[model samples]
Target chain A: MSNATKFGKVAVLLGGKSAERAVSLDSGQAVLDALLRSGVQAEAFDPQDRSVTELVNYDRAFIVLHGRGGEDGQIQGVLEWLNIPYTGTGVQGSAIGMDKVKTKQIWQGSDLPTAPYRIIVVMAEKWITGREFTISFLNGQPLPVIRLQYGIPCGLSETEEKKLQALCLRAFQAVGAEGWGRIDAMQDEQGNFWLLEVNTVPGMTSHSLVPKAAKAVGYSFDELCVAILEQTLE
Target chain B: SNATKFGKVAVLLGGKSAERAVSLDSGQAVLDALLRSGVQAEAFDPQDRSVTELVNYDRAFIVLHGRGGEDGQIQGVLEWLNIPYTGTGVQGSAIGMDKVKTKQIWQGSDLPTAPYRIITKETDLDSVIAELGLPVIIKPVHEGAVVMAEKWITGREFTISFLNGQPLPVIRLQYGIPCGLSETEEKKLQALCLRAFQAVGAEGWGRIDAMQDEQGNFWLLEVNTVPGMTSHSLVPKAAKAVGYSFDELCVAILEQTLE
Candidate 1:
């Protein structure tokens, strides 16, 4: 086995073009500190500027960026094109990880544990308002809760809904996501989980959904990070 | 003689093929055009239907290309159901789409084509290279489009680089087409290519692409049965060069029903 210390310069990339930028910065700083303390040469970069070109100088990248541009495979693609080995999933995995709909489909396909949910593009106002609408228009759907918090009605048209489903599926396929994660949805009184959006790079803070979910699966904070890194290396 | 207006026309597209996305785009475009032209057209993805249900359409506009759709598998299903569908029949479709078989037919017919070899599972790479020479193009024996086509120089250096951690059993070889040959060479290549077409039971249809090296040696690259329909694409250009209009081409294609 190759010694972990024998590994050359490591670029710990963090923060940029994501809603969770601050969390990424924190994670990056923490990882950089950890790597240095472990007798490995590591540097932290914001990844906002082209200085990321210096990433070519390193042997491998330890990406700590979360959400959107970072976790969704854009950086992975760049690294792949540059032929520079990096940590974390490839383009397909990254993109799939970020999208909620595709991840569920894969999860369902793999027969993994997940909540049952039906995708709705246009939540009909009439359906919620008790207006007269045909069952055909409902597509044999059962009555859902009227004013659920997570299941907020978004005014998407039927056509728009179909288009969204296709688009979301495409996005999932583009990233090649796999393995397990939670997809954000709302639960009604009847226990229906209605998908709203996907959280690929969920928060890592104490109150973060991912950490909470991870804890449910018997993984501590350190264990979760280690598992993620281990998976990425594979 | 009765001209029947079918109740439904499902344009099938996007199968388990490398060209799945492209198939979907083409299906959408074809569906839109058919609707505008007063045809009752609806789009269906092959992934959404069983073999039996897919063949239930009145006359399927098979917009799928490559693999499951284009290589005669879907056509065979439709044939089993006795349904009429547009495009080449099963035998022709299957033969025309496979590179290895097509090359054999070309060689047999004295068609003008580039010299080639098939690298099967048991093919000896060293002997094959010795026969075909260095800088030969290696490709997937059964693949659509240029998924993996690269030039391989015959040597320990080239072989080592190509085989870097790759599995031992690899399929790679060279191919030829007749177009770039001199008058004498062209005659032989063209004859072989046409013979290949006939051998595969595909005559006067489909698109054949060729590749040439820096040394001006030409080789047959690929044969696309349901080639791209856009004007600037290879098949369309080839058809037009042979004096067929776009509409004429479409009509000619539509006339060749699979069932």
Candidate 2:
């Protein structure tokens, strides 16, 4: 990660005014630590505490922020308006993916696997008893499929793993998700995989699925941080 | 005037898109209505003026119909400028503008829509026809026209307008309402149209078009996040069914900005 200097001044955005604020704080802090340890000039910038207009001062934005003001299109729109390059999904994908309903709609529309559910402000999905899993992606390529049983690999055959990897890639791109993110899914008793959701900004805590998947793929916590930030370099 | 609450409105129209002519018509009609209703509204053509000038306006009435106007570009600008605008937000507007994404979302939601496949330069038309069948209607995915083939629905075309959050009366294309369907069928169609509208996150006032096959089943066609407000536009026609004069309709739309 010697080219970390190429990122210039970086702002690790986190902890916005969302229900996920607490998780964002941990995610942002972990990311900040990893980035700094990787030799990148990084600082923790919480949008909930600072005016977004100030984002213009940073050369690049490392968005670890989760939920509404951060994960939703709001900040991405502001960043677009300010012309600051940021990691992961653009304005459209962030906004669409944040709405679970629309994400399922897009997924189902594309014939991707997802469980059935109904909604009335709150949605209730048909219960499917099975193992929940998450697959992390960096630059549109699948890092590794972590069976969300504390981020363990599913001991599937090589063919099964390859199939899931291809499905994961399509599912990620189906929502226009870019850079680094994670796709949560479930495998039912019948062995059918159903997509759960897409986290445009997956958490970066040591226990986070993304970091665990990256670790299995030979990326250290700090290296994973630089890999994600490297996307915004261009 | 009740309109006093909505100060300095920009009737956004006539953008740099292929649909500029229709947008100008929609903008002028909306401008006239807002003015007649005693609202402080003026025409603000993005084609002629810089979007930075929008900082002076308190609210926006988006009437532009295609590309930069309807495709979320101007919506993103308004969001950044902090000017509340009528019609859909950036995400929905962008999705609505892209036919493929719109259909995909509708399909994902288990809604009734036609089968379709995106086309690329390497795509074989024969294969597309084999998948979606012949007689498919090809349209651009975006305004730029990387096309896709949609299975043609041979049936009567109809449009439903949504205001605030509820569906206004439905209108059969070129036939107006009283749409020749039973109250029960019309109600079902209205509900379906409403679901399709919400599925795209379209807000304020917009239009949804659908087709009723000979079998009497309805297939949602597409969403119009920024529908035209021209005197003869479908939304105004349906609004008139619900007793909304053109001026009142325009004011009702602008009122949503306050919310």
Candidate 3:
């Protein structure tokens, strides 16, 4: 049970007929190549030209489709109906991730802090939901304070210092997220925070936000890659 | 497939949810309307058939109500099928289906709603009576939301139907001291409903259930994303008031799927 072989035949779900199809092709190939290099049995899957029923033949999926259709709950729902174990967020989280309005609402409802819609930030933010690495998991590791914008020690200001640290872990739990994820959030003029949506399959190509965050915390690209792949071990 | 000329339309309905029967009823209603309007409409049942069979369809007219049908599951499936489906996408559907979660969001926004306590084995009956009082509605982590507490009112109730957040004609419900809202107050009730539905991030077509106190303030109730369409349904009745026949209502709902 080594490499991805023990994980059975992995299906790297790639390009789809979405607006982000080209970027999806890149993320898919990158994930597929990494899985292959890691000695795992992985193959390509493109819903644009193939039938999803053909997806039944695969054991698991390493979803790398970038935006729209893939990140939205649509593909996640397909995986749910098909009963295939795919990487990243589930149906609800994926859906909520697609919507910043609901993301802020749920966080506020949970008694968590977030800016209202009156405060909007068009991050075009990638709300990635490989669940943010465990919070307590930070202490032992030389983890960056989750934010390191060079001058900004932890990628946050005093407004976000306390909330951002706890919110990512707490919010992902509300959506029942697991593994590693990147929750995009911002503070408004009054210092109240706003949640950007979630991206179930974030990019892993060199300059991807997730890998960038991991690198700031001293994780090599492959190490983080192996870490994400390790979650599907079950 | 084109929007105006949607070819091989699938009216997806009926699942293992509590409202499967209601969906079946709504399904036939939608299918007949689409056919009468002269479109390529057909019925697709999840209980007996498979979504994988949707290969030939151009778009999906989601008439299914409750649980999986309205709760983002089928939306997800249709999304993967790359076919346009009716109504709001996953986020809205998931939130729309959960009553407690919806309340929390409304509460945060200072939107008017009832206050109730979560019950457990150790819950005090006397304390419950003191807070919510008699005739409390109990919700056991089940379908929709029911409110309790001192906030429950004795005034008449109404269900306001909305499409794309626009208010439709309102209709008073039956089974109690049912009385219609006066024309003087009708416009206000409709405005309140429009705000209530939008506050919850609800889209597509839905019915907003709300209670009016003797003082004229409105307390929000649950939002039904996939409101029913039987002859006994409220959405249809309200639609009727606005001059939308069942056929027109069905076609209109299908029209939105184009965008």
Candidate 2 is graded, for docking, as acceptable
Q: Chain B TM-score for each model?
A: 0.68, 0.95, 0.88
Model 3 lDDT tens row, B1-259: 3335877899987876888988899989889989998888989987788779987899988878776777788888777667888887776777777676667668766687787665555667788878876777676442753332333567767888887558887777753212367775788878877876777767778888888878888888777888888878888777777789999888888887775
Q: After superposition, how far is residue A229 of candidate 3 from its true place, in Å?
A: 5.4
Q: Say which candidate scores most in lDDT.
A: 2
Writing each residue's lDDT as its tens digit, candidate 3 over A1-234 gives: 587557788888889877889888887777777778778888999988888878888887777776777776777777766667877776667766666766666677666655445533252332332312212122112233343233225545555566565666677665445565656555555545555545556766655666666666676766665567666655
Compare the candidates by TM-score and give the number of the best one.
2
The superposed Cα distance between candidate 1 and the true structure at residue A124, in angstroms, equals: 71
Candidate 2 or 1, higher lDDT: 2
Q: What's the DockQ for every one of the candidates?
A: 0.01, 0.34, 0.50
lDDT (tens digit, per residue) of candidate 2 on B24-138: 9998998988898889999998778866678889999989888776666677667656789988998888798788888888887678889988877678778888888778887
Q: Whole-model Cα lDDT per candidate?
A: 0.50, 0.83, 0.70
Runs of candidate 1 with Cα error greater than 4 angstroms are A1-234, B1-8, B120-124, B145-195, B211-219, B230-232, B237-251
Residue B139 lDDT, candidate 2, scale 0-100: 78
Each candidate's fnat, listed in order, reads 0.00, 0.45, 0.71
Ranking by lDDT: 2, 3, 1
Question: Candidate 2 local accuracy as lDDT?
Answer: 0.83
lDDT of 2 by residue, A61-110 (tens): 99988886667777776666466898988877888888888888888777
* Chain B TM-score (model 3 vs. true structure): 0.88
| Runs off by more than 4 Å, candidate 3 | A1-6, A17-23, A37-40, A115-144, A148-163, A174-178, A185-199, A209-234, B1-6, B108-110, B116-142, B145-156, B163-165, B174-179
- Candidate 2 lDDT score at position A73: 72
